[PDB]
Homo-oligomer: A and B are copies of this chain.
Amino acid sequence: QLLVPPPEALSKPLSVPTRLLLGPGPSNLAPRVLAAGSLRMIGHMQKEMLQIMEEIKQGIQYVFQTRNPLTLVVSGSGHCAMETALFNLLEPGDSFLTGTNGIWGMRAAEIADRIGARVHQMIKKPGEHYTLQEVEEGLAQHKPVLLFLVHGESSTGVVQPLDGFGELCHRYQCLLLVDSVASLGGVPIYMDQQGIDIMYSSSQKVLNAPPGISLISFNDKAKYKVYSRKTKPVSFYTDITYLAKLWGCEGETRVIHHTTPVTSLYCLRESLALIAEQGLENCWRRHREATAHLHKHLQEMGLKFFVKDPEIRLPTITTVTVPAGYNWRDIVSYVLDHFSIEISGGLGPTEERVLRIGLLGYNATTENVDRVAEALREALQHCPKN
């Protein structure tokens, strides 16, 4: 008799409800992504898989607007890629500076502390962005080798201006790493033209692919920092010298490394195809249009924006101050139960303070906005008020 019996809970079929996902992520899957969902497996090193990897690389290069050959997929999620960037770029004792204007800069600082960097932070109140003058003051004070800046701050609903920051860093012999997990595909970014040295994003926000994989690109200046290291990075399986060879970024010959997530790659390939077919300008315009419609409905319902400066409101994820007198969990639950729409509360410094509404890629439509606006109106008239 075996110690542990077959779990009764697994004896029933798997079913998932049909919902409209308008939170900060994951987003709903695009039809072409859904169609790729039941493709068969092939060997991860076979010629057809190497071709899919090359197409993905080309797609990443297009969406990032980079020619960097060290552009690839990291086999992990949400912000994970963040560890790949920091483990490779930072050595013990290196001066590291973060734009801590929300949960993401704080998390980067935590990761850098774990690997022994000398971590410095420009701390700003949630809802705020960094000016060039503020960044210059941090660079001059801390003399960092790397600056971490968040483009789309999903915890606070802030979009950071990017023009000029990379060249400012280069004047201080500092590299610029940008997080565009919540912004890529929805907000203009020109990695090379803006002087961004390292950038990462994820599959499950604007790209409408399943969560679990991430996108990263390092320029040759960043690669030079990695090759100048005294020691190997702490992780073998995110070591960019190994990943570069796996992904064919150093010419013809590969190296055996890990088993890549083949079905996730199929989905990402389709997601990138969709963006390439629509074109970035049209993608950027659709997000601006969807968000403008949402902001009009929010103002009409009497909801207030967490971000006071309209010019720094992130198009893709909007932070709404919880309405006075209501329990925000009642609002979220009402929308879920009566309309089958997912929205969220806050994150990090905005926990208990806001609602977050995401309009991401395939989901950034005025029709979806109309649906969540109706749900919120009904929640406001029925949820208990004090």
Which of A62-70, A165-173, A220-228, A368-376 contacts its partner?
A: A62-70
Within 8 A of B (CB), among A199-235: 202, 204, 210-213, 232-235
B52 touches A273 (CB 8 A): no
User: What residue in chain B is nearest A52 (Cβ atoms)?
Assistant: B14
Measured between alpha carbons, how far is A262 from B78 in the docked complex, in Å?
12
A311 within 8 A of B: no
Instruction: With both chains docked as a complex, state the minimum distance between the C-beta of A198 and any C-beta of chain B, in angstroms.
Output: 17
Does A384 count as interface, using CB distance less than 8 angstroms? no
Evaluate contact between B58 and A43: CB separation under 8 angstroms: no
Query: Hey, which chain B residues are within 8 Å of A273, CB to CB?
Result: 10-11, 14
Given contacts A10-B272, A115-B234, A276-B11, contact A62 B5 (CB under 8 A): yes
A54 to B260, CA, bound (A): 26
The reply to whether the CB of A132 lies closer than 8 angstroms to some CB of chain B is no
Chain A interfacial residues counted at CB < 8 A: 98
Selected interface stretch from A26-34, A145-153, A292-300? A26-34
User: Is the C-beta of A263 less than 8 angstroms from some C-beta in chain B?
Assistant: yes
Q: Is the CB of B259 within 8 A of A67?
A: no
Q: How distant is the Cα of A61 from the Cα of B7 in the complex, in angstroms?
A: 9
Scan residues 104-142 of chain A and give those whose CB is less than 8 A from a CB of chain B.
Answer: 107, 110-111, 113-115
Interface-central residue, A15, A16, A82, by most chain B CB under 10 Å:
A16
From B34, B41, B58, B237, contact of A83 by CB (8 A) = B237
Kindly provide the distance from the CB of A93 to the nearest chain B CB, expressed in whole angstroms: 15
| Beta-carbon contact of A7 and B276 below 8 Å | yes
- Mark each residue of chain A from 46 to 62: 1 if its CB lies under 8 Å from any CB of chain B, else 0: 10100010110011011
Question: In the complex, A16 Cα to B53 Cα: how many Å?
Answer: 13
Q: Which residues on the B side are within 8 Å of A15 (C-beta)? A: 39
CB distance from A342 to the nearest CB of B (A): 5
Out of B27, B54, B113, name the residue touching A41 (CB < 8 Å).
B27
Inter-subunit contact B23/A193 (CB<8 Å) = no
- Chain B: which residue is nearest A276 at the CB level? B6
**Residue-by-residue, is A252-290 near B (CB-CB < 8 Å gives 1, otherwise 0)?**
000010111111101101101100110111000000000
A211 — which chain B residues lie within 8 A by C-beta?
44, 259-263
Please tell me if A347 contacts chain B, counting CB pairs below 8 Å: yes
Q: List 5 A-B contacts (CB under 8 A).
A: A25-B259, A26-B43, A37-B263, A210-B264, A212-B213
Residues of A within 8 A of B (CB): 2-7, 9-11, 14-19, 21, 23, 25-29, 32, 34-44, 46, 48, 52, 54-55, 58-59, 61-62, 65-67, 75-80, 82-83, 87, 107, 110-111, 113-115, 190, 192-193, 202, 204, 210-213, 232-237, 256, 258-264, 266-267, 269-270, 272-273, 276-277, 279-281, 342, 344, 347
